[PDB]
Design an enzyme around this catalytic site. Structure first.
Site, mmCIF file in Angstrom:
data_model
loop_
_atom_site.group_PDB
_atom_site.id
_atom_site.type_symbol
_atom_site.label_atom_id
_atom_site.label_comp_id
_atom_site.label_asym_id
_atom_site.label_seq_id
_atom_site.Cartn_x
_atom_site.Cartn_y
_atom_site.Cartn_z
ATOM 1 N N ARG A 156 -1.794 -4.279 -1.154
ATOM 2 C CA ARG A 156 -2.792 -4.871 -2.033
ATOM 3 C C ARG A 156 -2.537 -4.536 -3.493
ATOM 4 N NH1 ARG A 156 -7.501 -1.991 1.109
ATOM 5 N NH2 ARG A 156 -5.803 -2.104 2.651
ATOM 6 N N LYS A 159 3.026 7.893 6.645
ATOM 7 C CA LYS A 159 2.755 7.423 8.006
ATOM 8 C C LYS A 159 3.286 8.402 9.057
ATOM 9 C CE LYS A 159 2.838 2.436 7.052
ATOM 10 N NZ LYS A 159 1.392 2.267 7.338
HETATM 11 C C1 LIG Z 1 -4.654 3.014 4.290
HETATM 12 C C2 LIG Z 1 -5.407 1.870 4.965
HETATM 13 C C3 LIG Z 1 -6.731 1.611 4.243
HETATM 14 C C4 LIG Z 1 -4.520 0.611 5.008
HETATM 15 C C5 LIG Z 1 -3.320 0.659 5.973
HETATM 16 N N1 LIG Z 1 -2.445 -0.462 5.693
HETATM 17 C C6 LIG Z 1 -1.140 -0.268 5.616
HETATM 18 O O1 LIG Z 1 -0.586 0.821 5.784
HETATM 19 C C7 LIG Z 1 -0.276 -1.481 5.334
HETATM 20 O O2 LIG Z 1 0.436 -1.239 4.152
HETATM 21 C C8 LIG Z 1 0.645 -1.725 6.548
HETATM 22 N N2 LIG Z 1 1.811 -2.522 6.215
HETATM 23 C C9 LIG Z 1 -0.235 -2.355 7.646
HETATM 24 C C10 LIG Z 1 0.276 -2.293 9.058
HETATM 25 C C11 LIG Z 1 0.332 -1.087 9.754
HETATM 26 C C12 LIG Z 1 0.792 -1.046 11.075
HETATM 27 C C13 LIG Z 1 1.185 -2.220 11.711
HETATM 28 C C14 LIG Z 1 1.122 -3.427 11.035
HETATM 29 C C15 LIG Z 1 0.675 -3.465 9.715
HETATM 30 C C16 LIG Z 1 -3.760 0.646 7.462
HETATM 31 O O3 LIG Z 1 -3.828 1.732 8.067
HETATM 32 O O4 LIG Z 1 -4.002 -0.482 7.938
HETATM 33 MN MN LIG Z 2 0.941 0.861 3.819
#
Ligand SMILES: CC(C)C[C@H](NC(=O)[C@@H](O)[C@H](N)Cc1ccccc1)C(=O)O
Ligand SMILES: [Mn+2]
Ligand SMILES: CC(C)C[C@H](NC(=O)[C@@H](O)[C@H](N)Cc1ccccc1)C(=O)O
Ligand SMILES: CC(C)C[C@H](NC(=O)[C@@H](O)[C@H](N)Cc1ccccc1)C(=O)O
Ligand SMILES: [Mn+2]
Ligand SMILES: [Mn+2]
Ligand SMILES: [Mn+2]
Ligand SMILES: [Mn+2]
Ligand SMILES: [Mn+2]
Lengths: 499, 499, 499
Positions: free
Chosen positions: A356, A282
């Site tokens: 997931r 991230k």
């Molecule tokens: C890689 C993508 C397909 C999925 C990705 N999801 C994630 O990173 C999750 O694990 C995160 N925990 C989702 C999230 C990100 C920012 C604020 C609140 C919630 C996302 O960018 O939403």
């Molecule tokens: Mn994630």
């Protein structure tokens, strides 16, 4: 957070009740309902005399604090504006309650009595209003100051009395009892979400579950470590965990409040105690908020805490899939292919789609309970915030009746969700040339394709999925921190299933 | 695109029908329905003999083409696989029809006869299957080659016969008639969307509407220029247009198929003929696809074209708000404040949120028609693609019955939408310290806050909003171009209102 | 904004003064200064009796509102906490004043009397405390609601009385008089900054200056258009303006309050009424805040407005260099080379470094006034926010005495600046292979190299440069909008020069 506020329901006359602060509602135009008129008459018109001066316009949440008035046993009288409508909405009722609470917190009074029974709230009778009022008050008392050297000054306010007509008092008491248990569960949820990730890691959450079993003899807990996960074949759960020094945990909570013949309800929570994204790292900005990535699992704790206090006649199972997502020389790579518990292979195209991957193995594990419903709760997609913002959780599922039950519960709790479709056309976005499933579906319909991924592991039972990425915490400002949602929705759902 | 395919419904025996190509369905396992068995028996088992060789597995869309068979009057026999289930879904039925059409397009046969009446489609009777089949075939014939120097080779196929039982033929004919009109409207919609923005500008669309009125004497058209818009006080519409050399147009279509006492239905279409973003300029990558930013207005053209062909007994109004969004030394700036037709002031924080600024003035204009429903259609938010992808339109509105009617229509048409909530809590995201409304609500809930913005101009009537940013075109690959959606949903909605 | 609050200084006893609200300070521990003790004694201990209940901890800004108390002529008594220290800082004093004002705004009282003379503020006597108190109160009354359809409810509060000892009353009155004029100038500055850029363009600012000359007969105004700028040879000023449809203006304000032999002080203000960046276009996010890019010029308006009200014995010149920075087919390009008024050629490497290009020609123009000081004020660099944030203006100059005078003035006004060095080593960052100067110095020391660029046009007089990019407005939240800074610093500087 120890809470401890005493909520009492009484049917006595407000104008003779001994209290540090008597709280009355005032409408726009200085208009007085039945309780406020009776108090005014008792003082000889002192309240209407003050209101005539014009300092309190009566808009929702405005306040005017009076000291000792003639012939009252209340040391103070707090007037709070209730607007111009005959009926408040849920938001307005909460705003009024929060304004009252904020004033009372700053006073030295040891108690306050709320003479707010005359307020009307659209679509809510005595029980439903008590649920909203007491939950707002009790949750508004939450404090997290564990790592502050300068602690909060303790509140003098230790008791709140709700005045109700005799005919309504039983329903108000029931609503208060349920709201207090929900707010107590919310406080546990918020504590765990707010704890920093160097403290609140999977092993810590396992010990928290053992702690909850010491407090509640009706709760049984099992904590499974990485050796057991490997024995069970949860390859995608283990793939998420392997990059971190912190071992993963699968926490199993079981409560049997109904007869053995009643199939259980299963709550599955995403417990990612910190999400760096992994090798698919991230950006740095705001990444601290990923300490809330275990708020799904925390909401299972909180819902259990409410159910255990209420001793509901239901059979309930909680599965908390807990891991920490870290980059390292042994972390999972984009392009890795793993075998899930179910036997389905997954191509991990992006290591930041990790929630997931722990949930799907927990959903397969859930099959053994022969459940009558399975609900997973996860801070799963940023796309859900784009779709539904920060105030409405995303909801998806494979059974229309269960989805409708959860929507209805969120409406009653004022902790709302909204359904998104899992049309079969979206499923092809998860096609992989190399495995049974890819773990990402691309830039389009991200909340839905995440739900579609999970659905492939939930085909054997009635299942729903709550994506709380937007509703589980507040990102910034003075009130940054975990919300405790969706404990109110989930507990309401279970209350209805327990009837 | 001139279309011109003749669709006929006949109840004659397939095995004696003279045709260039007879099309029969084959299930997995070489299984033969009633029509295919009758043809096989007529040939003395020639079809089952070939199938026994095993070249056609019978999966949906697979084909095997036979030449002259004994005792048939068909020059060719086309076998198409229908899968293993007793009932196809909508997607499978379309895939089968498209596979048939693709084969027929490459043959030199002047006609083909479809003996597909034995196929079953989940939840669809004779009329509903004919609607899907004929729309898929007719729309599959669409060609856009206006600017190709090398034109498409003309098809030899000029006639398609649908074979149906006598008891079903009236419903099949009705479905075919309606589907042809929908596909003809789709072709106009697709043409306008596909035209490049140096050709298809607002003035051009005004001339297209006058052209449609020459073709259909029941249609009346008025085209309003920038002088009239200023007279009417449409300050936000004019703010979008002022940066471009191309003048704006408000196009008014009126069709009165019902008695004068019947209130009209109003369709409002976003006609941004090209969206650069303005001073809030878009990135260069993929910006060519903003030639489809007038597809909302184009779908009003197409829906009118279908309604005019069918002569439906309804009163219909179309409002096409057309402008081009350009940067220039006179363009609207971020931070400009304008006065809308309604009198509400709008702070234009981002000049790329321009569709809602032409739509809101058109929604105020719509009040004069005393409408019984108002539907706007707009390629409005990238957030809608995040929320619902490319296959389901976003739907929002201020009246639950209208929203449900549109959802039901999209289901029947297989051109689906999905509701998103306009909860009042989202409205505060549009608060501006400087004006009555800001034109953007920030990064959260972008599709919803756009709908919330529009709702502030639709309070006087029953209104819904279709965000077709994902469904109005295909972005890349061989099939890049406008889809014609949501003409099928809208026409189905009007067909139901006309009963 | 019409203001109109009456500020009075009186030396009467607080406990017999007729007023709607008497305001008293309370220290932590319920401690009472001389005025508050005298009022308490007059009521027979009613105030100390209430304080003993403990509702008011006495932290800075906390409040407790009392109604009618025995033997007082005050209808209400407002207690405001003053903290635990013997002496407040400037920030704490402002916070106390703002808390008082916020309470009074919500009351129906037509006046209030402030018995705050007992408060001590570090390093400030009677006059200096009155300057801070009255400026905070008067500026806190500012309202901008020009484009709101729902206007602010008018305040009932129309009069504020400052109670002071007889020995201090003359200094308090002087401080109040000066603070009111500063706040009146601030209100004009804030109005112009807050106005949107489709309204507040250079031509509009020229008409505003003519309006100010109608109000103040001692002010003379000349407004020069693009023909005159070309006659004068201001090639870089014209280069900024040429991309926009809006013509530029050079506004000249002249006030001669001193004898003809006294050299004038010149204020030069950046009046970029909107900054898109030009061909070097800015990103869309937050670009609306570039309507504040004329706040430098607006602060010259506001400083003149304060000086004209006070009739200071000084000779003052204002030069407002006003243009709008737009992209267009005729806009200045990166790489253009222009000839400034001074004859120095400038290579315009980045069209978003446009403020220095209108300022440098105005600095050359300023030579004709034979000034004894020249101060330019400009929202000039994002780098200044990186260096000094949003609360301290950047200050640069070619004369140490002038720089020190401005720093001292900002300290006294609590509208502080901070010097950055113009070491000759930084000048080489502006070297161009193609012209005498490049208009950018690269990523290092951006605030300084902008000041270095300007210094090349100020060599003939004593000059300073205030970069108010961070201090001229508040970016977001409820209080988004222009601040009126640095009118307090500039007016204080001139007050000191007038002695
Ligand atoms: C890689 C993508 C397909 C999925 C990705 N999801 C994630 O990173 C999750 O694990 C995160 N925990 C989702 C999230 C990100 C920012 C604020 C609140 C919630 C996302 O960018 O939403
Ligand atoms: Mn994630
Ligand atoms: C500025 C934002 C609040 C709104 C903005 N919307 C727009 O630019 C619309 O005018 C676009 N026509 C929406 C769009 C963009 C890309 C693909 C399909 C559709 C968007 O980014 O969605
Ligand atoms: C191109 C650069 C050398 C200079 C450039 N300066 C500008 O754009 C000025 O004209 C801006 N008016 C400076 C500014 C930007 C953002 C917020 C407050 C103030 C900057 O980026 O600071
Ligand atoms: Mn995560
Ligand atoms: Mn746009
Ligand atoms: Mn657009
Ligand atoms: Mn600039
Ligand atoms: Mn600028």
């Amino acid at each position: 957070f120890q809470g401890g506020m005493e909520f009492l329901v009484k049917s006595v006359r407000p104008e003779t009740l001994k209290t540090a602060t008597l709280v009355l509602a005032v409408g726009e135009g200085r208009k007085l309902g039945a309780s406020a008129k009776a108090v005014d008459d008792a003082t000889g018109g002192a309240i209407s005399a003050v209101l005539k001066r014009g300092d309190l316009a009566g808009k929702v949440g405005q306040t005017l604090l009076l000291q000792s008035l003639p012939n009252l046993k209340a040391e103070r009288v707090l007037l709070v504006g209730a607007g111009k409508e005959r009926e408040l909405g849920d938001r307005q009722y909460r705003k009024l309650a929060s304004a009252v609470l904020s004033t009372l917190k700053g006073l030295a009074g040891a108690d306050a009595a709320l003479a707010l029974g005359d307020l009307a709230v659209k679509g809510r009778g005595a029980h439903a209003k008590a649920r909203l009022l007491v939950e707002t008050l009790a949750d508004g008392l939450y404090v997290f100051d564990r790592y502050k050297s300068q602690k909060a000054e303790p509140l003098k306010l230790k008791k709140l009395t709700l005045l109700a007509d005799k005919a309504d008092s039983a329903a108000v008491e029931q609503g208060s009892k349920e709201a207090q248990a929900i707010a107590n569960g919310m406080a546990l949820t918020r504590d765990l979400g707010n704890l920093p990730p160097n403290v609140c890691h999977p092993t810590f959450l396992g010990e928290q579950a053992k702690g909850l079993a010491k407090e509640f003899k009706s709760l049984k807990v099992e904590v499974l470590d990485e050796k057991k996960l490997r024995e069970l074949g949860m390859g995608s759960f283990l793939a998420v965990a392997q990059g971190s020094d912190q071992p993963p945990r699968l926490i199993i909570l079981q409560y049997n409040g109904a007869k053995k013949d009643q199939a259980p309800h299963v709550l599955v929570g995403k417990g990612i105690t910190f999400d760096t994204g992994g090798i698919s790292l991230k950006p740095g900005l705001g990444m601290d908020e990923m300490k809330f990535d275990m708020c799904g699992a925390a909401s299972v704790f909180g819902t259990f805490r409410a159910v255990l206090e209420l001793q509901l006649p239901i059979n309930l199972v909680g599965l908390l899939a807990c891991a920490e997502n870290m980059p390292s020389g042994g972390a999972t790579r984009p392009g890795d292919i793993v075998t899930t518990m179910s036997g389905q292979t997954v191509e991990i195209l992006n290591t930041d789609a990790e929630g997931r991957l722990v949930l799907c193995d927990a959903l397969t594990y859930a099959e053994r309970f022969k459940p009558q419903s399975v609900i997973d709760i996860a801070t799963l997609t940023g796309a859900c915030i784009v779709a539904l913002g920060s105030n409405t959780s995303g909801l998806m599922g494979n059974n229309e009746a269960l989805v409708r039950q959860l929507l209805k519960a969120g409406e009653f709790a004022d902790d709302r969700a909204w359904q998104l479709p899992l049309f079969d056309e979206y499923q092809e976005q998860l096609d992989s040339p190399f495995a049974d499933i890819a773990n990402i579906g691309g830039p389009k319909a991200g909340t839905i394709t995440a739900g579609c991924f999970l659905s492939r592991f939930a085909k054997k039972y009635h299942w729903a999925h709550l994506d709380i990425a937007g509703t589980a915490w507040i990102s910034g400002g003075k009130d940054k921190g975990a919300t405790g949602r969706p404990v109110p929705l989930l507990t309401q759902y279970l209350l209805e299933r327990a009837k």
